[PDB]
């Protein structure tokens, strides 16, 4: 199954968390990351379209986030307010999709 690992899962304030994604499906078209536990356009952090490497900052972007291809999300410069859930939607080539969440915490 599709999975997310916050590296580290408990991070000191001002450092960085990487959300690693395991078991991506084989046929991805692109990805969106969301703040919270569900897919909601109003809480979209960032996305990526593989065919043209288009990055798509959304309303929850804070100028700290980087989406790689593989779907991994790097958030630099974390604050106590970044503690919470993060949800990935992977849109496949056939436009079917998969969702996974997504947690980390931040101290100091």
């Amino acid at each position: 199954q599709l999975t997310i690992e916050a590296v580290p899962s408990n991070a000191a304030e001002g450092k960085e968390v990487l959300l690693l994604v395991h078991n991506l499906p084989q046929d991805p078209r692109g990805y969106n990351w969301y703040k919270g536990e569900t897919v909601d356009a109003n809480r979209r952090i960032i996305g990526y379209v593989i065919s043209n490497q288009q990055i798509t900052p959304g309303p929850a972007y804070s100028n700290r986030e980087t989406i790689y291809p593989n779907a991994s999300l790097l958030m630099r410069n974390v604050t106590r307010n970044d503690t919470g859930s993060y949800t990935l939607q992977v849109i496949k080539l056939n436009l079917m999709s998969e969702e996974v969440t997504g947690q980390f915490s931040v101290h100091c």
Partner: protein, 108 residues
């Protein structure tokens, strides 16, 4: 001008049918997914649709009574007491900056 769902009729006799209309579809659309309930959740997927290939793909909530159309309308036939509730449409777009709307009807 946001994506919005309209049911016709809202109040449906058992055994009759309901049509869920989508207003203000984005130009950029390439596909659709209709979900049972209030959110995008692959486990509640009724049916996905690719506009260009006119492929409908049933999800786990598909019950043999639901039809999707190229304007994203969802027709549900032969309704039961169990169908009362919410239905959520996601419109997938070529930039994957997707839009969602919900979606309600009631069976007496």
């Amino acid at each position: 001008a946001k994506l919005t769902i309209e049911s016709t009729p809202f109040n449906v006799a058992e055994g009759k049918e309901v049509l869920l209309l989508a207003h203000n579809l984005p130009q950029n659309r390439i596909g659709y997914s209709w979900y049972k309930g209030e959110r995008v959740d692959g486990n509640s997927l009724i049916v996905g649709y690719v506009i260009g290939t006119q492929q409908a793909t049933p999800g786990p909530a598909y019950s043999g009574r639901e039809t999707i159309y190229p304007n994203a309308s969802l027709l549900i036939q032969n309704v039961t007491q169990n169908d009362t509730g919410f239905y959520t449409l996601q419109v997938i777009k070529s930039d994957l900056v997707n839009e969602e709307a919900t979606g309600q009807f009631h069976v007496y």
